[PDB]
């Protein structure tokens, strides 16, 4: 039976589970690799990872090597025909109307559901990945296998609920703050009992709150826990030598988590694979700032 893919460009047929699978957006490899689907192509993001697979999903290349993609100039057409797919995953890619045409020329193509081109909402990738690679009942216990673990968090640390939580990029822009407003990409702090103080609401620009200067002191002072998704040490003296973050009380009362590198990459990634590697190594930082 084929598998038929509604999405933002119409409806993709995929005859039979695929055989060579690129991977075009920034973070699909987790969950075909989830689900024993080794993609010939992986697109690079960040954090100079080997093939662009962080460590959690790694070990399910079963030491292949797929082809380095990269959005640095646009999707790599030319690369991607040379590939010769079967099927082509575009969903976190930033596909529009014209490169959609251009990678259904080469294979079927699976797009975006909906108005995010990049980052829609992790479940919603995660399904759309399953049922394409004829793996929808496997990927639906990963997804549910996320929510409990961040769930049992929750029943560990009663104490947190309620407790304010921000979630901030690891740097300043042309001197802001960024947070990530509450939406999809906070459920996890949610599952774990917190709340997103609403001190960012004021400030949205799309999915971010981009902080004023003069609005950084009393916007993190809100919060009970501040996880900053810092990529290096240097990312984290930079944060603590803002004059607005170092006179905080967030800064003087010590509520800041810095993230390690692997940490802020599992954050970013929020996939079947990556969110029990925040569900492991996220609380223990947590309880050293609220109390367990």
């Not at 797919?85 to 559901?113: E, F, K, M, R």
């Not at 916007?219 to 006179?247: F, G, R």
Request: charged content about 20%; aromatic content about 8%; proline content about 6%.
């Amino acid at each position: 039976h084929a598998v038929t893919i509604t999405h933002l460009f119409g409806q993709t047929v995929i005859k039979e589970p695929p055989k060579r699978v690129v991977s075009a957006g920034y973070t699909e490899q987790d969950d075909l690799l989830a689900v024993d689907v080794v993609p010939i192509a992986v697109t690079d993001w960040f954090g100079d990872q080997p093939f662009a697979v962080w460590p959690w999903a790694a070990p399910k290349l079963g030491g292949a090597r797929p082809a380095v993609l990269n959005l640095d100039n646009g999707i790599q057409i030319d690369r991607i025909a040379a590939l010769k797919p079967d099927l082509i995953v575009a969903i976190n890619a930033g596909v529009d109307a014209d490169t959609y045409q251009q990678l259904s020329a080469i294979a079927p193509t699976v797009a975006q559901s909906g108005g995010d081109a990049f980052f829609e909402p992790w479940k919603d990738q995660a399904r759309s990945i399953g049922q394409a690679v004829f793996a929808a009942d496997r990927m639906r216990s990963l997804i549910e296998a996320v929510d409990q673990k961040f769930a049992a968090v929750a029943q560990r640390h009663p104490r947190w609920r309620g407790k304010k939580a921000l979630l901030l990029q690891g740097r300043l822009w042309q001197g802001n703050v960024v947070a990530t407003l509450a939406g999809w990409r906070t459920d996890f702090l949610n599952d774990m009992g917190l709340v997103i103080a609403d001190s960012i609401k004021p400030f949205a620009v799309d999915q971010r709150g981009v902080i004023p200067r003069d609005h950084i002191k009393a916007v993190l002072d809100a919060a009970d826990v501040l996880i900053w998704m810092t990529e290096s040490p240097e990312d984290e003296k930079a944060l603590l030598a803002d004059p607005e973050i170092a006179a905080s009380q967030a800064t003087a009362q010590r509520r800041h988590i810095f993230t390690s590198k692997e940490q802020a990459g599992a954050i970013a990634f929020s996939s079947v694979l990556s969110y029990p590697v925040v569900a492991e190594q996220l609380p223990p930082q947590i309880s050293q700032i609220l109390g367990a």
